[PDB]
Amino acid sequence: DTILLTGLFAAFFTTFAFAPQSIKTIRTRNTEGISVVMYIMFLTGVISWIAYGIMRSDFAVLIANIVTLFLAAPVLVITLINRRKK
Amino acid sequence: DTILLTGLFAAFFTTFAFAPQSIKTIRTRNTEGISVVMYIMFLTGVISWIAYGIMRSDFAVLIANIVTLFLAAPVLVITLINRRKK
Ligand SMILES: CCCCCCCC/C=C\CCCCCCCC(=O)OC[C@@H](O)CO
Ligand SMILES: CCCCCCCC/C=C\CCCCCCCC(=O)O
Ligand SMILES: CCCCCCCC/C=C\CCCCCCCC(=O)O
Ligand SMILES: CCCCCCCC/C=C\CCCCCCCC(=O)O
Ligand SMILES: CCCCCCCC/C=C\CCCCCCCC(=O)O
């Protein structure tokens, strides 16, 4: 009981800590400095965490990385779009 | 067996994806733009993940956030030092 709350407590802080940065990027479409390779590596891990979370029945790990996915994936999309404009 | 390997696989990619950014910050001591509040929130969650990882017997979650701690904490330290120089 208290142990799941701990994970959700953790998930809340780590996910929303730098969330305003991703939101700003999505809003302004400014992707200068963003590495495509780093985000692909990052997303690869995020997907793997989701698989891990399912196999572990860990909703804390699950919701943390699902929200991360919904924040990171649009950032990479915009980055790839801006990259191709040149 | 394969499920723990999945977590370690995930931990490898998410932790080392943006690790060169933290290393660069530690090396150059350039902390412009870094929010103290965001890192304190982030570290609060990281610590909570560690507690969660211990209570879950999850070495994937554990090693991911311990390494994160060793990367994030020095960044905040340098940030607080640079902040006080003014
Ligand atoms: C998130 C966008 C990255 C841009 C740079 C952000 C700088 C913040 C400092 C380090 C990177 C964040 C660490 C990675 C945060 C990813 C969150 C995650 O994957 O959760 C997994 C948990 O289930 C297991 O603990
Ligand atoms: C905006 C990014 C693209 C979003 C597309 C949809 C995102 C799908 C994310 C995860 C799919 C896996 C869902 C698994 C549910 C786990 C629940 C369970 O069975 O315990
Ligand atoms: C099973 C996981 C499948 C997930 C597939 C994800 C593919 C990407 C899908 C949608 C990308 C996000 C689109 C959101 C639009 C936001 C506006 C913008 O980014 O410009
Ligand atoms: C450089 C940052 C400061 C580092 C200080 C030391 C870091 C300590 C990090 C975590 C301490 C908790 C260790 C718990 C071990 C878990 C193993 C287990 O019992 O399963
Ligand atoms: C149980 C967890 C206790 C952890 C306490 C952590 C307190 C901070 C300790 C050390 C800070 C990191 C010091 C590393 C020096 C790197 C060089 C530098 O940052 O300038």
Residue numbers in the entry:
A (entry chain A), B (entry chain A): 2 to 87
Quoted from the paper:
We crystallized EcSemiSWEET by the lipidic cubic phase (LCP) method and obtained crystals belonging to the space group P21212 (Crystal-I). The structure was determined by the Se-Met single-wavelength anomalous dispersion (Se-Met SAD) method and subsequently refined to 2.0 Å resolution against the data set from a native crystal. A total of six TM helices from two protomers create a central cavity that is widely open to the intracellular side. This cavity penetrates into the dimer core, but is completely occluded from the extracellular side and the lipid environment by the tight association of the extracellular regions and the surrounding TM helices, respectively. Hence, we designated this structure as the inward-open conformation. The high-resolution structure of Crystal-I revealed the presence of a monoolein molecule occupying the cavity of the inward-open state. The glycerol head group of the monoolein molecule is located in the pocket formed by symmetrically arranged residues in the dimer core. Within the pocket, the hydroxyl group of the glycerol head group forms direct and water-mediated hydrogen bonds with the side chains of Asn66. Given that glycerol and sugar share similar polyol moieties, the glycerol head group of the bound monoolein molecule is likely to be mimicking the sugar substrate. In the present structure in the inward-open conformation, the putative substrate-binding pocket is occupied by the monoolein molecule mimicking the substrate sugar, indicating that the observed structure represents an inward-open, substrate-binding state.
